[PDB]
Design an enzyme around this catalytic site. Structure first.
Site, PDB file in Angstrom:
ATOM      1  N   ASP A 346     -18.907  27.149  -8.014  1.00 20.82           N
ATOM      2  CA  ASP A 346     -20.356  27.082  -7.892  1.00 20.82           C
ATOM      3  C   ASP A 346     -20.745  26.706  -6.465  1.00 20.82           C
ATOM      4  O   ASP A 346     -20.159  25.797  -5.871  1.00 20.82           O
ATOM      5  CB  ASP A 346     -20.894  26.035  -8.885  1.00 20.82           C
ATOM      6  CG  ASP A 346     -22.403  26.037  -8.999  1.00 20.82           C
ATOM      7  OD1 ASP A 346     -22.944  26.990  -9.591  1.00 20.82           O
ATOM      8  OD2 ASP A 346     -23.048  25.065  -8.531  1.00 20.82           O
ATOM      9  N   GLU A 375     -19.361  31.501  -5.377  1.00 20.59           N
ATOM     10  CA  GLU A 375     -20.687  31.890  -4.898  1.00 20.59           C
ATOM     11  C   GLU A 375     -20.745  31.604  -3.404  1.00 20.59           C
ATOM     12  O   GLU A 375     -21.055  30.496  -2.985  1.00 20.59           O
ATOM     13  CB  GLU A 375     -21.766  31.097  -5.611  1.00 20.59           C
ATOM     14  CG  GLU A 375     -22.052  31.472  -7.035  1.00 20.59           C
ATOM     15  CD  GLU A 375     -23.230  30.666  -7.559  1.00 20.59           C
ATOM     16  OE1 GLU A 375     -23.134  29.413  -7.571  1.00 20.59           O
ATOM     17  OE2 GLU A 375     -24.262  31.275  -7.904  1.00 20.59           O
TER      18      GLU A 375
END
Ligand SMILES: OC[C@H]1O[C@@H]2O[C@H]3[C@H](O)[C@@H](O)[C@@H](O[C@H]4[C@H](O)[C@@H](O)[C@@H](O[C@H]5[C@H](O)[C@@H](O)[C@@H](O[C@H]6[C@H](O)[C@@H](O)[C@@H](O[C@H]7[C@H](O)[C@@H](O)[C@@H](O[C@H]8[C@H](O)[C@@H](O)[C@@H](O[C@H]1[C@H](O)[C@H]2O)O[C@@H]8CO)O[C@@H]7CO)O[C@@H]6CO)O[C@@H]5CO)O[C@@H]4CO)O[C@@H]3CO
Ligand SMILES: OC[C@H]1O[C@@H]2O[C@H]3[C@H](O)[C@@H](O)[C@@H](O[C@H]4[C@H](O)[C@@H](O)[C@@H](O[C@H]5[C@H](O)[C@@H](O)[C@@H](O[C@H]6[C@H](O)[C@@H](O)[C@@H](O[C@H]7[C@H](O)[C@@H](O)[C@@H](O[C@H]8[C@H](O)[C@@H](O)[C@@H](O[C@H]1[C@H](O)[C@H]2O)O[C@@H]8CO)O[C@@H]7CO)O[C@@H]6CO)O[C@@H]5CO)O[C@@H]4CO)O[C@@H]3CO
Ligand SMILES: OC[C@H]1O[C@@H]2O[C@H]3[C@H](O)[C@@H](O)[C@@H](O[C@H]4[C@H](O)[C@@H](O)[C@@H](O[C@H]5[C@H](O)[C@@H](O)[C@@H](O[C@H]6[C@H](O)[C@@H](O)[C@@H](O[C@H]7[C@H](O)[C@@H](O)[C@@H](O[C@H]8[C@H](O)[C@@H](O)[C@@H](O[C@H]1[C@H](O)[C@H]2O)O[C@@H]8CO)O[C@@H]7CO)O[C@@H]6CO)O[C@@H]5CO)O[C@@H]4CO)O[C@@H]3CO
Ligand SMILES: [Ca+2]
Ligand SMILES: [Ca+2]
Ligand SMILES: [Cl-]
Ligand SMILES: [Cl-]
Length: 651
Positions: A346, A375
């Protein structure tokens, strides 16, 4: 997250030679390198080590029950490089503990950051022989083979979503164990749960947060009332989430049941990817890090306020040596203790490059086939730009995959302008964006280039837990279209993901056109919004079979799975194609493909076309024949209708 009814005291600086926890010189002091942070339980003694350099005193507080009063409070001894140690010479099995420190004038009590087991809602550390949590045969656990990241097909899933629908046919609804149940059946007798997932042919299940997240997200003592959260609010990084266990009040239950889940997935041919959230904690004022060493583990601006580049209130200071050590040792804990096969980071752009490369290096020493994706968005932070592990710095992050947002938006339209069309929905000018993703995001040539050095760095997707589902985005961007036209656009988007170079990524339920009723950000929406709707799955079995057939096509054709950018540049060729289409060939047995050549057409044009085919031999239809009116042997293809066509020249 919340307003903190209290004070943060950053310490009596005489304890650290006049050097403040904020000073740049602080990093070079107290850099403990031992492997024993936390508690190590033995039948005759338990050994504690706490890193707390700014504290003037430190204690182990012992509890007999998860909600009880302290039964013992023992002072620790100041040890090397900022640590405190204590050996408790008794059988500590079944006890709970916290640390209590004095930092400045404040006395703070906190769970061990290195907790491996906790009581309900994660408020006390549980002392536990973790070998007692291993399933029968855990020693013989074996991973399914994986030759290349490009051979993975990732299926993104939330543990509660999987089974909480009333017609899921799964007994342990909302639990880790729900994904171990075989032979489960839904409406009209369809396969659900594990049998549905293995039947699709996916290779990896990527699980939304299974680490322990905050009580504000899901209260583990009130599971008899409605609850739901994605779990992006980390509280205890190294223990599983209690609400996914059959008994949140039994410290061992969540550990054993997660291991049983991983064991079963491996035995059924699936690998497991863990979504990890090392970029922020649930509350910067209340987290154990801030109670034990205030000012160290989180990032601060020059004016001593939190850096908030995560939009979650705080950022973890991954670049500071002891937090880097923490993150690495946490990842290695999940690999060694739980046999995890990959990690999805994340907000990876909030983590520093040195930390990410060390993670990748340490994992390669264990098993190079462990996946690392994240990400890699470009986002502002106090962390200097050249250290951010994002797309702009992808050439510094070899072997780490990043979600290809350029391909995502080219295929289905802008995710932040809900009504904006993309390639599948008949928008103008998206063909080159689709081509960039077909090539796996590499520097293919001309304007066909993205951030990837190698196709293993590009994760292709048109749906994930974030933002509207693909179905809901199509609905908002095609107000004048029928649902039958929308289903054809949906199928085309899935085909583009599974026939592009790089790593294909599917959201659970994409196979049956999952809808959230138009909800854009469903992180705390009720189960009626977030469940895998097995009634819809039962009504969409043809669409499920189409996804299964796409996954099978990619497995049958290594030309879609090329491991290197040099191979892509040598074998992939884009063909002249009309507006709202993309056509390419994969030539000369690419990647070991059994066929001499493949031709792929992405057709977003609803009418009839006659297309020229390259003169490479006798083409034959392999996929999408429902769209093919004729294949003329000067070779030409007569097509009609929105969808993908694949042709091949046999060997
Ligand atoms: O009195 C000086 C001493 O005071 C403080 O120590 C206190 C401590 O803070 C309290 O926690 C408690 O200690 C109890 C402890 O917590 C329990 O775990 C248990 O201890 C047992 C150990 O668990 C067990 O391993 C074994 O210990 C043996 C050692 O492993 C072994 O190494 C050896 O110990 C020798 C040392 O290695 C050597 O250096 C020297 O020790 C001196 C220290 O270096 C010096 O700092 C000082 O110690 C302070 C201490 O720092 C304070 O925190 O003086 C020490 C010399 O007296 O010599 C050691 C040999 O004697 O051998 C030991 C013993 O076999 O067994 C013990 C149980 O015996 O119980 C502890 C209390 O019973 O209290 C102490 C103060 O009482
Ligand atoms: O602000 C909090 C925010 O948090 C969450 O957003 C997450 C998001 O859901 C994830 O998808 C991801 O976002 C990353 C994204 O996927 C990447 O592609 C990239 O984003 C780039 C775009 O690709 C690119 O096109 C461009 O974006 C431009 C837009 O196209 C353009 O429309 C405009 O954006 C404006 C919006 O239209 C407008 O609505 C408003 O945006 C607000 C949102 O409405 C509001 O919901 C919230 O956003 C949440 C989000 O819902 C969470 O899910 O706050 C927004 C406040 O601005 O205003 C916008 C003005 O910028 O302009 C943009 C920029 O030019 O560039 C972007 C940026 O690179 O990176 C994304 C991450 O940065 O992760 C996020 C974060 O977790
Ligand atoms: O079972 C799921 C399926 O059910 C329904 O389909 C029924 C159909 O409506 C009936 O017409 C009949 O089908 C028979 C057909 O009429 C005969 O022609 C013959 O079919 C042969 C073809 O003629 C021959 O060309 C070849 O077919 C190959 C294709 O040319 C080639 O493209 C590829 O097919 C792939 C598809 O292109 C692709 O879309 C995907 O197919 C899936 C569908 O998209 C999905 O909706 C669902 O299909 C439903 C259908 O919608 C219902 O109407 O699942 C499909 C399978 O996953 O994947 C295909 C496979 O790669 O390859 C094929 C095969 O090589 O051979 C065939 C068979 O010999 O016989 C048909 C009867 O078998 O009945 C069916 C239900 O039986
Ligand atoms: Ca929790
Ligand atoms: Ca690698
Ligand atoms: Cl529950
Ligand atoms: Cl940036």
């Amino acid at each position: 997250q919340k307003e903190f009814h209290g004070t943060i005291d950053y310490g009596d600086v005489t304890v650290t030679g006049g050097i403040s926890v904020f000073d740049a010189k602080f990093d070079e002091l107290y850099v403990y390198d031992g492997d024993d942070l936390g508690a190590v339980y033995a039948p005759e003694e338990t050994r504690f080590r706490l890193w707390a350099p700014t504290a003037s005193e430190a204690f182990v507080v012992l509890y007999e029950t998860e909600d009880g009063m302290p039964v013992k409070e023992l002072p620790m001894k100041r040890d090397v490089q900022g640590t405190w140690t204590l050996t408790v010479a008794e059988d500590c099995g079944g006890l709970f503990y916290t640390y209590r420190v004095k930092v400045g004038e404040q006395w703070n009590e906190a769970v061990d950051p290195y907790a491996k087991a906790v009581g309900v809602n994660g408020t006390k550390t549980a002392i536990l022989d973790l070998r007692s949590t291993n399933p029968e045969g855990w020693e013989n656990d074996q991973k399914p083979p994986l030759a290349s990241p490009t051979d993975a097909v990732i299926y993104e899933l939330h543990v509660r979503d999987l089974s909480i629908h009333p017609q899921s046919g799964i007994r342990e609804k909302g639990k880790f164990l729900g994904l171990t149940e075989e032979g489960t059946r839904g409406p009209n007798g369809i396969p659900t749960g594990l049998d549905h997932i293995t039947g699709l042919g996916v290779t990896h299940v990527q699980l939304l947060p299974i680490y322990d997240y905050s009580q504000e997200s899901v209260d583990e003592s009130r599971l008899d009332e409605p609850h739901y959260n994605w779990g992006y609010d980390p509280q205890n990084y190294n223990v599983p989430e209690g609400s996914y266990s059959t008994d949140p009040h039994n410290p061992a239950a969540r550990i054993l049941e997660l291991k049983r889940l991983i064991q079963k997935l491996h035995a059924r041919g699936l690998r497991v990817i863990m979504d990890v959230v090392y970029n922020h904690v649930y509350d910067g004022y209340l987290i154990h890090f801030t109670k034990l060493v205030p000012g160290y583990y989180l990032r601060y601006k020059a004016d001593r306020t939190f850096s908030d580049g995560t939009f979650c209130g705080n950022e973890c200071a991954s670049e500071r040596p002891i937090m880097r050590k923490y993150i690495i040792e946490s990842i290695l804990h999940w690999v060694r203790e739980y046999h995890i096969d990959g990690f999805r980071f994340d907000l990876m752009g909030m983590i520093d490059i040195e930390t990410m490369n060390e993670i990748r290096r340490r994992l390669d020493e264990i098993d190079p086939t462990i996946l690392t994706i994240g990400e890699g968005w470009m986002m502002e932070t106090v962390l200097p730009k050249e250290l951010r592990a994002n797309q702009d710095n992808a050439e510094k992050l070899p072997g780490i995959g990043m979600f290809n947002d350029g391909m995502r938006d080219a295929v289905k339209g802008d995710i932040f302008i809900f009504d904006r069309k993309g390639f599948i929905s008949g928008g103008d000018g998206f063909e080159d964006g689709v081509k960039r993703g077909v090539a796996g995001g590499i520097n293919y040539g001309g304007q066909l280039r993205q951030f990837a050095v190698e196709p293993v760095q590009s994760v292709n997707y048109v749906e994930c837990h974030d933002n509207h589902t693909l179905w809901d985005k199509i609905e908002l961007s095609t107000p004048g279209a029928s649902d039958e036209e929308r289903r054809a656009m949906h199928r085309l988007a899935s085909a583009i993901v599974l026939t592009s170079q790089g790593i294909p990524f599917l959201h659970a339920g994409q196979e049956f056109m999952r809808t959230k009723g138009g909800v854009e950000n469903s992180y705390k929406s009720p189960i009626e919004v977030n469940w895998l709707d097995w009634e819809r799955c039962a009504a969409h079995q043809d669409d499920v079979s189409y996804m299964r057939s796409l996954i099978a096509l990619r497995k049958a054709h290594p030309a879609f799975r090329l491991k290197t950018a040099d191979e892509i540049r040598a074998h992939l060729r884009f063909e002249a194609a009309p507006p709202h289409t993309v056509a390419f060939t994969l030539r000369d047995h690419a990647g070991g493909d059994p066929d001499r050549h493949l031709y792929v057409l992405y057709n977003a044009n609803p009418g009839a076309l006659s297309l020229e085919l390259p003169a490479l031999g006798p083409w034959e239809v392999r996929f999408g024949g429902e769209h093919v009116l004729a294949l003329e042997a000067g070779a030409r293809l007569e097509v009609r209708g929105v969808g993908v066509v694949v042709l091949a020249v046999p060997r």
